[model samples]
Target: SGLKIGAWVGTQPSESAIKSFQELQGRKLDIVHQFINWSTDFSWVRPYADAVYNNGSILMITWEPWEYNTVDIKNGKADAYITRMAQDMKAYGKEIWLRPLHEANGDWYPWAIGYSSRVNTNETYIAAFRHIVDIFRANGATNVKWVFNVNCDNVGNGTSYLGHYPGDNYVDYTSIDGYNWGTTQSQWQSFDQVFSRAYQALASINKPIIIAQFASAEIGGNKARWITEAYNSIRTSYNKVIAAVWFHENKETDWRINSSPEALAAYREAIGA
Candidate 1:
C-alpha cells in the first residue's frame, strides 16, 4: 500500500527541513510532489531533487514560469524561461511534470479568468499550450509529462468554452484544483457541483485524475472534518481519483495540517501503507 500524501516544498529546502521530510520516506508518503515557483532558476532544484531521490522516494516536480498569469507571457520572456527550464530538467534526467498555468480557470490568479483579456483568448490559449508541448518535444524533452490543470467548477464563462482545449495529443494528465472552504451547502456542492462535472467533462478523454491542490478551510477556526470527508469521498470514488495532494499551507495564510504524527498515522491506516 502506497500513500500519496506529500507537501509541495520549494526547490531549495533547508537541511533540517530535508531531514524532517526524510523521516516520511517509508511512512505515509509514496510520492513527494514538489512545486517550483516560476521565478526561481532551475539551478535551485538540484539539491531538493537529490534529497528526495537519495531518500528512495518517488518524486514529481513541476514549475511555472509565466508568473501564474500576473506577468504577460509576451512581456515576461516566457519562451526563453520555458526553453531553459526544459533543457535543465532534461540534462538532469528528471521527468518534468510541467504545469505552466495552474488553476487557469480561476480568477484569483492573473493567468486565469479575470486576466483572460490580457493573457490570451480561448483560441490563443489552446494554440499556445500546443505550441509549448511542441517546443519541449522538439528540444528532445520527451520525458516531460504535461499536466493541464483547471480550477474545479469553473465553467459557463467565455474562457470556459470547450474549443480552447489543447487536446489529447499534448496532455499526459488532466487535473482539478479545488477546496472545501465555502458554506456547508457550498462545500458539499463543490463535490457534486464541481467534481461531478469535471468527471463528466474529462471522462471522454481517458486521462488520469489528479486533485492537484486541496485543503479544508472554515470561517470559525479549522475544517479538519472536511478534509476527512474529502478523503472519504475519494476513497469511495477510488477509480477516478489517482491521488490527492494537500497544499499543506505553510507560506502566507492558508489551512495547515494540525499534527504531523497523528495525521501521518491516520493517513497510513487509511491508505493501508
Candidate 2:
C-alpha cells in the first residue's frame, strides 16, 4: 500500500515469473522493473508490461540507448524511433514508468556525459531527455511517467548527477541506483552509507525519490543484518523514498534475497511477508 517494493527478476518476463516471486515474498509487488536496450523491439516489452499491469503492479522500464548517443537524440536523429515507442506506449493504455538513459551521470554507459571520446554534454543530454518526453506527450502517452535516475556515485570524469537533469516539468520521479558491494569492494557499507549523499542530493530536487536499483551481497558481511538495516533506514531516515526496487540478480555477486536462508528470512520479516 506504501513504499512500492519491487525487483528485477531477470529478462524472462512472464506472469508465472512474477507469480513465483510473489509466492516467495508472500506479498504482491507494487512495481516490476526491467531494463531494455535501444535495439530491443516493442514486442519484448508488450507482454512484460501487460503481465505487470495485469498483476496489479506498475512496470518500470530502464530504457538504455546503446545504439545511439545523446548528440544523436538531441539533434532529432532519433525522433522517428522515439515517436514509434511513444505511439506503442500510448496504445498500451496503462501507467508505465519510463526511465530512459538511466545512470547517464556515470561514465560507463554510451550516453554518459563527458566520457572518453564521447561528445555528449550536460546540455545535450538534457535536450535529448526533454525531446523524448516531448514526443511521448505529443503522442498522448499520458500514462508514461518519466523517471530521471542516476548512479549513486559519479564515476570517471562525467558531470555531476544534477548537471544532467532535464528540469522538474519533464521528470515525474527522481531516482538513484546503488548497491552494497560488501567485501566485493573495499569495505562493507550500510544502506545509509551507500545512499546518504545521493539521497540528500536527490531530495533537494523536491520530487518523489525512488531507489531504482539496490541490493547487498552475502560475502564478507552480515547480509541479514544489512537487510534489516536497509529497511529501517528506508522507513524512518529515508522516508522521502516512495519506492525501493531491489536488484535481485546473482550477477557479480549473489544480490538475491534468497542468497542465504537468514538473508531471505530477514527480508521476509522486514517486508512483513
Candidate 3:
C-alpha cells in the first residue's frame, strides 16, 4: 500500500483511543490496530479483520508469542498454530500488516535473539522467521505482508537491530520501534536521537521502513515540542519510511498524546489541524 498513518489498542476505528487521535487532527486514521496474542483462540483475528476493512481502513496487527520462544517456533512444535493462523488469515481474505515477534532483538521478550542460549539465538530467530513465512506461503495466505520489526535501541539488549534481520526476501517491510523515556530511562532524547542511527543502519535492508512503534512520555521535557519535532523530522528526513503507527497506549508511562489537554492541543497544531 501507499504511505499511510495510523494507531492502536483500539480494534474498532470508532474506539475512543483511535477516535481521540482523529478528534485532535480532524482526520480519520487510515488503519485499524490490533496487538494479538499468539495462543489466542483461532477466531480472535476474525472480527478485527473485517472491522478494519469495513470501516475503510486497513489492519496493522502485532502478533506476539509471549508463551513461546523462537527455538520452539523454529522446531516445528508451533507448526500447528502457525498453519492454523495462516488458514484463518486466508479465510479472511483482506490484506493486513502482520508483525510477528516484533522487537525480537530486544531482551525483554521471549522471542528476543541475544547471546543467551535459552531464549533465542540469532540463528534460531532466523529459522523461526523463515519457517513462519514458509508455512504462510505453503498455506497460500498471500494477503499477509510480513514485517521485520525491531527496537531502535538494541545496545542495552546486547544485540543490534541488524542482528535480527530475517533477510530482505522474507520481509515486506523493514520497521523500528522506539520511545523517548526522557531522563527516566536515560537522558531526554529526541525522536531523531532515538531513531536516526537505526534508520541509517536499516537502510542496507533495502525495503520500505515503518516507525512500527513510536510514542513519547510526557516527562522531563515538553511533550508538545517533542511532538512537533517528531512530525517535522519524519516529513523532512526519513524519506523512505512509507508509513508510521503511533503506539497509542497508556503503559509504563503516560505515553498517550492526549494525556494532557495541552499535549493534545500541541499535537493538533503540529499536524496543522
Best by TM-score: 2
What's model 2's lDDT at 265? 88
- Misplaced by over 4 Å in model 2 are none
Tens digit per residue, CA lDDT, model 3, 170-263 = 9998888999987666777999998998899888878989888888888889888898888888878988887777776787787776878777
Count clashing residue pairs in model 1.
Answer: 1
Candidate 1 structure, TM-score to reference: 0.79
True-vs-predicted CA distance for residue 197, candidate 2, Å: 0.5
Candidate 1 residue 99 C-alpha distance from true site, Å:
1.3
lDDT of 3: 0.79
Local error of candidate 3 at residue 45 (angstroms) = 1.9
Tens digits of per-residue lDDT, candidate 1, 92-191, equal: 7765566766665655555564354556556556666776777778778877888877777664345552445678898988877766555533433334
C-alpha lDDT score of every prediction, in listed order: 0.59, 0.88, 0.79
RMSD of each: 4.0, 1.2, 2.2
**Candidate 1: deviation at residue 117, Å?**
4.4
TM-score of each: 0.79, 0.97, 0.92
Could you say which candidate leads in lDDT? 2
Write the candidate numbers in order of decreasing lDDT: 2, 3, 1
